[PDB]
Amino acid sequence: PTEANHVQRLRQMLACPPHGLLDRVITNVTIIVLLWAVVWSITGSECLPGGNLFGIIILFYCAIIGGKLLGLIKLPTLPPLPSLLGMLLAGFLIRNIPVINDNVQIKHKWSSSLRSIALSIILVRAGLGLDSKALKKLKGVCVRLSMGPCIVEACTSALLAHYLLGLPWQWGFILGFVLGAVSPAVVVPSMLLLQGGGYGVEKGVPTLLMAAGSFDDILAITGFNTCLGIAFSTGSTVFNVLRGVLEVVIGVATGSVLGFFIQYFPSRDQDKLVCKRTFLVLGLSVLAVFSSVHFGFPGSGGLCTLVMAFLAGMGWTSEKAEVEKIIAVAWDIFQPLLFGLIGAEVSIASLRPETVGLCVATVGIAVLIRILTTFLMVCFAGFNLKEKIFISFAWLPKATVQAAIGSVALDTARSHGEKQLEDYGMDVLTVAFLSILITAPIGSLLIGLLGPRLLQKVE
Amino acid sequence: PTEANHVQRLRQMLACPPHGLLDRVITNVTIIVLLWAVVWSITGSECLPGGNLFGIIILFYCAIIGGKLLGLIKLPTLPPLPSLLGMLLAGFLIRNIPVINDNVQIKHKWSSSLRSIALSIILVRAGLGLDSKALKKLKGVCVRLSMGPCIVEACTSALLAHYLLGLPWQWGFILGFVLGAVSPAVVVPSMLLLQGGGYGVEKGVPTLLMAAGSFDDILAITGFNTCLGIAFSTGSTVFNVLRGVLEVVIGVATGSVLGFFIQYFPSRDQDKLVCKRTFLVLGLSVLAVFSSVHFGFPGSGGLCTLVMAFLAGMGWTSEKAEVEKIIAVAWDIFQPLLFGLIGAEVSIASLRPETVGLCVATVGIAVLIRILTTFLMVCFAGFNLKEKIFISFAWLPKATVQAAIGSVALDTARSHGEKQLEDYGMDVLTVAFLSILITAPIGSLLIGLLGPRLLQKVE
Numbered sequence: 001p002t003e004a005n006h007v008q009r010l011r012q013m014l015a016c017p018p019h020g021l022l023d024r025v026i027t028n029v030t031i032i033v034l035l036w037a038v039v040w041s042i043t044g045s046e047c048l049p050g051g052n053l054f055g056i057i058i059l060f061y062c063a064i065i066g067g068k069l070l071g072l073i074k075l076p077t078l079p080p081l082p083s084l085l086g087m088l089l090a091g092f093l094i095r096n097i098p099v100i101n102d103n104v105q106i107k108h109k110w111s112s113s114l115r116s117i118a119l120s121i122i123l124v125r126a127g128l129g130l131d132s133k134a135l136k137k138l139k140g141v142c143v144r145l146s147m148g149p150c151i152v153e154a155c156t157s158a159l160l161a162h163y164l165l166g167l168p169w170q171w172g173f174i175l176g177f178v179l180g181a182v183s184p185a186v187v188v189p190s191m192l193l194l195q196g197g198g199y200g201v202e203k204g205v206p207t208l209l210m211a212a213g214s215f216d217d218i219l220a221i222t223g224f225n226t227c228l229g230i231a232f233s234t235g236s237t238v239f240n241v242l243r244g245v246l247e248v249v250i251g252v253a254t255g256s257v258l259g260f261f262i263q264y265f266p267s268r269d270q271d272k273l274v275c276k277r278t279f280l281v282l283g284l285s286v287l288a289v290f291s292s293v294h295f296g297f298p299g300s301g302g303l304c305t306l307v308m309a310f311l312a313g314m315g316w317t318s319e320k321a322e323v324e325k326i327i328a329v330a331w332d333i334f335q336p337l338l339f340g341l342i343g344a345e346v347s348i349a350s351l352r353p354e355t356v357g358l359c360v361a362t363v364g365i366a367v368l369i370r371i372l373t374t375f376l377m378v379c380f381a382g383f384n385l386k387e388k389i390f391i392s393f394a395w396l397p398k399a400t401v402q403a404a405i406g407s408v409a410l411d412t413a414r415s416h417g418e419k420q421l422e423d424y425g426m427d428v429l430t431v432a433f434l435s436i437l438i439t440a441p442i443g444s445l446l447i448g449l450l451g452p453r454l455l456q457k458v459e
Numbered sequence: 460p461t462e463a464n465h466v467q468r469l470r471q472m473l474a475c476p477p478h479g480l481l482d483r484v485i486t487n488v489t490i491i492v493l494l495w496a497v498v499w500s501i502t503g504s505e506c507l508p509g510g511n512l513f514g515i516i517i518l519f520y521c522a523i524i525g526g527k528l529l530g531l532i533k534l535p536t537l538p539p540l541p542s543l544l545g546m547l548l549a550g551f552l553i554r555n556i557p558v559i560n561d562n563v564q565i566k567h568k569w570s571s572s573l574r575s576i577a578l579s580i581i582l583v584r585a586g587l588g589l590d591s592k593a594l595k596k597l598k599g600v601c602v603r604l605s606m607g608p609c610i611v612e613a614c615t616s617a618l619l620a621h622y623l624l625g626l627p628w629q630w631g632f633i634l635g636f637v638l639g640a641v642s643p644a645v646v647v648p649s650m651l652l653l654q655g656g657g658y659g660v661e662k663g664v665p666t667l668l669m670a671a672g673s674f675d676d677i678l679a680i681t682g683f684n685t686c687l688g689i690a691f692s693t694g695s696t697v698f699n700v701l702r703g704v705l706e707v708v709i710g711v712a713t714g715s716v717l718g719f720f721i722q723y724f725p726s727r728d729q730d731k732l733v734c735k736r737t738f739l740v741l742g743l744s745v746l747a748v749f750s751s752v753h754f755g756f757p758g759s760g761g762l763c764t765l766v767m768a769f770l771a772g773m774g775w776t777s778e779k780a781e782v783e784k785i786i787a788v789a790w791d792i793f794q795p796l797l798f799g800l801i802g803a804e805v806s807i808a809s810l811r812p813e814t815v816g817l818c819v820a821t822v823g824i825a826v827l828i829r830i831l832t833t834f835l836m837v838c839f840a841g842f843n844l845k846e847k848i849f850i851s852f853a854w855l856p857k858a859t860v861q862a863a864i865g866s867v868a869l870d871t872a873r874s875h876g877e878k879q880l881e882d883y884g885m886d887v888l889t890v891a892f893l894s895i896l897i898t899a900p901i902g903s904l905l906i907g908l909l910g911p912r913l914l915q916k917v918e
Contacts, residue, residue, distance in 0.1 A: 020726060284493070291496070
């Protein structure tokens with residue numbers, strides 16, 4: 001009834017022409033199709049509703065749109081909104097409807113490469129912003145944060161489904177590994193926003209927190225190697241452990257020599273010194289990533305990337321506050337494409353329409369297991385209940401590696417021809433896709449308010 | 460003998476360490492392989508001495524290197540050097556040695572697309588720098604400059620080889636068209652350097668000169684359509700003329716509507732207004748180019764591109780002096796790749812090792828025919844002998860379209876199966892490749908000195 005009067009009042013408010021912002025938004029929504037038509041003239045049907053690049057660009061577009069609408073018109077009366085949830089939900093819903101997803105068939109290799117490169121930006125962003133002084137005294141503490149809660153959560157889920165879903169004693173380790181991971185891609189943004197809030201950085205807290213997600217994935221994939229070699233009987237399991245350990249040692253060793261120069265002698269009076277260094281370190285990051293992938297040790301890339309980024313940042317300490325701006329303005333566009341690619345994977349009906357409410361428990365309890373074990377990791381270090389519960393709230397998000405190696409177990413079961421392992425694989429695919437959908441974004445939603453609640457800020 | 464003492468003296472001069480510039484050059488020569496390794500990890504052997512992208516990047520590298528060495532250590536005691544000559548000679552010499560060119564097999568489609576996009580930058584650079592006041596009174600004069608000398612040069616070569624090499628009366632038009640073209644890609648740089656010299660711009664001369672190379676190529680290709688339809692008996696020749704005329708009318712018509720907005724209401728208080736507008740107009744340029752290519756009217760692209768670039772520039776008149784900087788810093792890298800691509804086409808022995816010194820005359824005389832006909836185009840307009848001979852020296856360079864449609868006649872003769880037309884095609888391929896190798900760069904070499912010699916500059 002009153003909606004008509006409200007619309008008339010809005011039309012009257014727009015009668016005083018806000019032609020400025022209107023023209024801005026019109027130009028924004030009008031520019032879009034430029035590169036679409038460009039690459040269409042380049043390749044033809046590749047940019048049509050039957051083409052790969054068309055699907056890629058429309059995925060990116062619906063991803064950048066879906067994120068803003070999630071926090072555009074409403075707020076659940078206290079907080080703002082986690083746009084990244086909508087950014088990933090876009091690709092998810094595109095995947096859900098196949099009768100229209102049949103125009104978004106993205107090249108699997110290319111899509112995976114995009115997913116693997118998108119994380120490098122958040123990696124280098126984390127590496128530069130680090131501070132060594134506060135961490136140097138807390139090294140072992142952060143190691144405990146990075147190791148404890150995930151391993152205990154993993155074995156918790158392993159034994160939970162060992163009892164309920166019947167995992168053998170030598171195979172539930174796979175469920176452990178697929179549960180053990182971290183997604184700093186959403187964490188680092190929250191850490192930087194709270195750094196802008198100046199709350200935790202009074203102890204450097206946010207920089208210390210996001211620096212922890214380094215080796216948990218490597219332990220998960222090392223265990224994955226050896227557990228495939230044992231249960232899946234794939235090759236030498238002791239050599240699988242060797243493979244998983246060597247990818248740690250090389251990733252921590254080879255990353256140092258880059259800082260030996262870029263921290264010391266990237267000569268100062270170079271014209272585009274910062275403008276060079278930026279894409280230089282991005283190239284070195286993706287180089288480490290994909291060279292290690294080619295070698296078969298993808299975990300080694302992030303380690304060398306992070307240590308190199310921190311090393312140069314220590315040398316760039318003056319100018320590192322300027323290279324960050326280019327990385328920031330670039331990083332805006334690589335979030336939603338990554339989130340949509342992770343979302344555009346599978347649908348619920350293919351996993352199971354039933355037994356959903358009776359199988360989620362093995363991960364649902366593990367979520368809680370991680371929380372207070374994070375609290376326990378701080379044995380004697382000084383943090384009050386507010387600080388410790390804030391730390392506990394931080395280590396929760398896990399979305400990235402669950403998508404990275406989720407269905408690979410079922411794929412391996414198919415490739416090797418093991419029907420019992422194939423039912424195992426459909427189940428682990430189920431639990432893997434469950435371990436992504438809500439974990440990270442609902443965990444990062446709270447940070448923007450728990451910062452003010454538990455941390456302190458200068459006047 | 461004294462070379463040893465000279466080297467010892469140079470070593471003594473370097474004993475006082477110039478470590479700054481040395482480190483700069485070391486970093487420069489060291490950075491190179493970054494993207495090579497990146498795209499190698501992306502595609503593998505595509506970045507090896509058997510891959511396409513490898514050949515592309517090494518072409519670009521030898522092109523950027525060969526240009527600087529051409530003017531690095533010596534000067535022919537008066538002038539500086541035309542780097543672009545070396546930039547193109549690099550690709551030429553890579554093409555010449557096949558036993559090593561067999562690692563540089565570039566995708567023909569991709570290479571042609573690069574050659575076609577590289578010109579768009581010089582196009583938009585020409586469009587923005589134009590001034591309408593001086594040209595508005597000289598419109599017909601510039602039309603005469605653009606039409607007269609090339610047509611007379613074309614029919615000159617046509618009848619020359621009609622007599623000497625035996626061209627029929629209805630077929631030498633092909634030789635005319637392949638002789639009638641222009642290469643502003645080298646001209647506009649000279650015009651902008653002399654504008655910086657402030658010599659001709661006291662009458663706006665350099666801006667007026669480079670604006671002439673617009674329609675000569677279109678007339679050449681229209682005649683090409685109808686002459687193929689007549690001599691090569693390919694389709695309706697009257698419809699070939701219709702095709703050649705419609706590509707003029709649409710290219711001059713459709714380019715206006717873009718300026719109707721971008722000259723008037725790309726709202727001022729947009730954040731990246733210039734940073735947007737730049738790649739916006741680049742996209743519109745390449746869009747016109749390749750959409751017209753898809754339609755089959757490639758000449759229409761440059762027209763819409765140029766009129767749109769000038770229109771917005773008129774509106775950007777204040778800020779157009781700022782968008783130019785991004786286009787300038789970008790244009791540095793697209794020159795040498797284009798020049799190498801044009802160079803990497805064919806070798807002399809495949810055309811003819813003999814009859815060279817007895818067949819060049821038909822174009823060698825035509826070179827001179829163009830010169831004084833350019834002088835004659837200025838019927839009554841006021842320009843002294845120095846100004847008129849400067850104008851005559853300007854219209855000379857022709858390198859682009861000769862490479863664009865040179866061998867296409869021989870290819871057509873092969874496709875249609877006409878052996879007499881195939882010998883015709885090897886001969887026109889010969890004369891086409893002759894009409895590129897020295898024409899433009901030796902013609903632009905002189906401008907940097909003829910400016911001071913014939914033009915005037917403020918104190």
